[PDB]
Design a protein around this ligand. Sequence first.
Ligand SMILES: Nc1ncnc2c1ncn2[C@@H]1O[C@H](COP(=O)(O)OP(=O)(O)O)[C@@H](O)[C@H]1O
Ligand SMILES: Nc1ncnc2c1ncn2[C@@H]1O[C@H](COP(=O)(O)OP(=O)(O)O)[C@@H](O)[C@H]1O
Ligand SMILES: [Mg+2]
Ligand SMILES: [Mg+2]
Ligand SMILES: [Zn+2]
Ligand SMILES: [Zn+2]
Lengths: 531, 530
Amino acid sequence: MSSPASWNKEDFPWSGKVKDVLQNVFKLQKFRPLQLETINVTMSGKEVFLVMPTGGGKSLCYQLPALCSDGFTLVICPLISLMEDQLMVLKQLGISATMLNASSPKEHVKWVHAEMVNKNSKLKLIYVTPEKIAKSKMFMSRLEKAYEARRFTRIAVDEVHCCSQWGHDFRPDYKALGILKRQFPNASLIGLTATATSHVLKDAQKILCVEKCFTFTASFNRPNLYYEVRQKPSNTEDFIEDIVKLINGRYKGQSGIIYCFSQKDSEQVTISLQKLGIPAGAYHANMEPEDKTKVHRRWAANEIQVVVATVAFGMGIDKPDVRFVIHHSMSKSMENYYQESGRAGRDDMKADCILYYGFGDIFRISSMVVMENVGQQKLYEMVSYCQNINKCRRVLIAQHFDEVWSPEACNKMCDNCCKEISFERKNVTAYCRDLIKILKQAEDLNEKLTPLKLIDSWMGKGASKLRVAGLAPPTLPREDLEKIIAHFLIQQYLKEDYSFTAYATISYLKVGPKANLLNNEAHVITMRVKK
Amino acid sequence: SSPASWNKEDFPWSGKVKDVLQNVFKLQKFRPLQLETINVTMSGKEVFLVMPTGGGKSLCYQLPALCSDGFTLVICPLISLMEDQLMVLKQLGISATMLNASSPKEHVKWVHAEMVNKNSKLKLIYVTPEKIAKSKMFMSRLEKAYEARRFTRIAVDEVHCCSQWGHDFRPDYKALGILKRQFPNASLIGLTATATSHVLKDAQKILCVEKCFTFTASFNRPNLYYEVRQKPSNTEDFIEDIVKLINGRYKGQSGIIYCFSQKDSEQVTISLQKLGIPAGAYHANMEPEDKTKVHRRWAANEIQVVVATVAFGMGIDKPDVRFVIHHSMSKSMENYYQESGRAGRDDMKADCILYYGFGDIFRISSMVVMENVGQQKLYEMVSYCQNINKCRRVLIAQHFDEVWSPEACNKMCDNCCKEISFERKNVTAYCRDLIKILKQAEDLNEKLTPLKLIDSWMGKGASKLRVAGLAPPTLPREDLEKIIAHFLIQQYLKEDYSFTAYATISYLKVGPKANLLNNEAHVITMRVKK
Ligand SMILES: Nc1ncnc2c1ncn2[C@@H]1O[C@H](COP(=O)(O)OP(=O)(O)O)[C@@H](O)[C@H]1O
Ligand SMILES: Nc1ncnc2c1ncn2[C@@H]1O[C@H](COP(=O)(O)OP(=O)(O)O)[C@@H](O)[C@H]1O
Ligand SMILES: [Mg+2]
Ligand SMILES: [Mg+2]
Ligand SMILES: [Zn+2]
Ligand SMILES: [Zn+2]
């Protein structure tokens, strides 16, 4: 990555117009880190890649230069919902912008096509899907005439990581976006993304023929965020009651976000929150722009205090004063959890990120990510984070952001750093040999045990056909047995087995690959517990 | 992975395998690596087979399906490709079916029941990778079928699509690792035409195959005679030269003509039919009933020549194709090899004639603007057309990184058979001259198509440049065309594309290597005919 320090100045020829536009058009007071530096590189006509967390303020880095320049900026966006999010903001500020996609009606294409070459056009930003570049002969011809006419001046590729083959959400049409620099060399190009994945980045600039460009990365550590992991109650109504108790206790009247795993979860939490005295509203990426406005305005006006969102690509909820982000269920990955929880405290003031860890959520999420080649490994990293009690949470998260995370100290801004608790290693080897007996007897019977069935047999319940004769139940609460099995799953003494049923993927437990170590009587399985 | 140890017929299934080979598929012998690949699958191991298109990869999983219990699941990327297989299997009396996005509900219900029907005749089920990633119901039936020991084999056609290190990465191929993870006792076979060891090692990880045998076929087709001819300027004279060539050399024999565009194929077909050659056009998107008609008329010689257009999905496979004529050059050496490789599948001598046209360089270059390496891939083909001093197999082997020699070709290509005398010509003065016209075009602010700047070179075209004694070099047009093409490959000149309302257009400009002409000692040479 390049050093931005030299660009963190307001002594450029355009600096006066930039500060004008920032305050009197966008109605913002100061730049966030790396905004001015990225803008200055683009404004100087140079190529730049910006790596900044979701919610960090990337859009401004190309929207503002468009408003300070002649003509328009072409923005490459992967989703129509993402373009509508941007057009909603730009429309509210009184900025002329538009979009083109495959489903665009003919009368609108004819309009945009003509406005691109119209020297008296108000259009400053034109958002198009990569298909408009690869699979539209007509649009390219207008771009060529716009470019020759000095009206097409800048290129912005949002979600530039889609270019590379080794990154999230690869779009095939992004590969062809290298044509832009080859055909329009005097147009500066900016790449925006929240991953860092340096291979993905160095590769994206090669696909874009923008090799080596300035590459700026923001510091991903958010020192004002307090990270916490809580036990998720087994009872759904006890869980929603604990959430309402937590909101009124700590965050009385403050705006917050609740992330749910599923679309059903998000909707049912909202009505439960409403009954329990918390004004809440759901937000989804598939929503109509007028529905998104409905939520955004009620959230800003404190009509609804909590926005219950469901984890999906297209989340356009950004408020500067989000005081708490609660994860109703854990994320699919550590990278996802950082970005989702990172929507808190964008006003640089203290904000809490509360994660509710549930044993059942391990298998519900594992089953949903079965088709992702590394879905299980990525989820078990999240579960391992929930299980950790002896490491700073900021250190655990930073492990996934190695190139973009300052070593900067946590300063008691996570629960593990704050709690003055001692730990102790317990022997759980005999419990593992018990679980393997139950599972082997189910194999002899051709019975697949879910965690529910496996725990039930362990306790002396469930089908007596799945119980083992001499196996005394452990005399431990059901959630200690859950903790033990979760430990055996991460350490791969147990392993998941997926079963595809007509309507859903289901998780079963099976003898894991490390269970053979228990043939040597000297092998001891321990567990760190709170003392 | 040594195929020798597998090249034997002393397995328990060996009798059944020959039975099926001769009495169902009705082939007499195996082609190289077929028996070895079949033997590896039949013994329950994972195998990757790298074999050119048309080599006979499909049989390596279709035949084992007939000798095994239950059905074999085939992962295919295109609907047209699975229909190509389903047409053959129906002809041979083999029960096979397919599932796709457009599949009707009654056909899905039928397939779903046959998969769990212990007495079902379905031997092969062809599905798209979305049926694995995005169908709960199908995976549910696959699991039932697998537990009932009815789902025993997996075939992944175009297995290179798994790995993203390659340009044909199909996103849904990423999820195909679920198959080995969920169905470990089912052996998996990967079929591909792309050899690159880099992409194949990654695909073996994506598919979660630990012990994978890899068999690779050689590129060389020893019975194929490779030749490059000039493409005549007039379309009607060209089609006349083609008909003369068929009636002269290939009287009454089956052949293929490859065309660049959709209307080229249609225009060639009618010109052949009027000129006395029974011909038929073929496309990859065609109906399975139209493809059936073409193959049947071709076998019965109702149609002699099949005019095809270069595309992904061509199932024209006839063993006795005596000639393949390229009406226009292919877009790449990889395409030209596979397209010409459809000739002489009966191991008898077959001719591969490529017609090289200067204007075709830019027709193809403009059409491949969206391929990141479309231009580089085409210039290799143009370089092959330009070569006069090397064995064609040396140029082809160069494409696969193989080396070769004329002794290995043994008088089986035009450059090996027709020995012409040549000389290195100093064309640097021609290059400095060509740059002058292009610099003057910059001064007048308009740029040039390929047609223009031969005309200025010769003193034509609205008096573009007439200074510093640029008389025509006293060389024919076809020689001036070859000179510029050499200067395009060696990037003293470069292409400029312009996007117009209806098509992409190519212009020329001073290429990046023109700086070396500041050193007067720099000499640009080119071999020309004596
Ligand atoms: N300099 C700034 N000052 C205040 N708010 C900002 C600034 N830059 C961006 N924002 C706000 O941050 C929110 C999210 O920004 P966005 O463009 O979505 O970033 P990203 O594209 O990284 O998610 C927006 O609502 C925007 O108004
Ligand atoms: N051993 C063989 N002998 C004769 N013909 C064969 C043999 N194996 C395959 N073929 C024929 O070759 C043609 C093309 O085979 P195909 O399965 O399309 O190979 P690929 O999948 O590699 O393109 C088919 O029409 C088939 O009948
Ligand atoms: Mg963004
Ligand atoms: Mg095939
Ligand atoms: Zn900490
Ligand atoms: Zn030769």
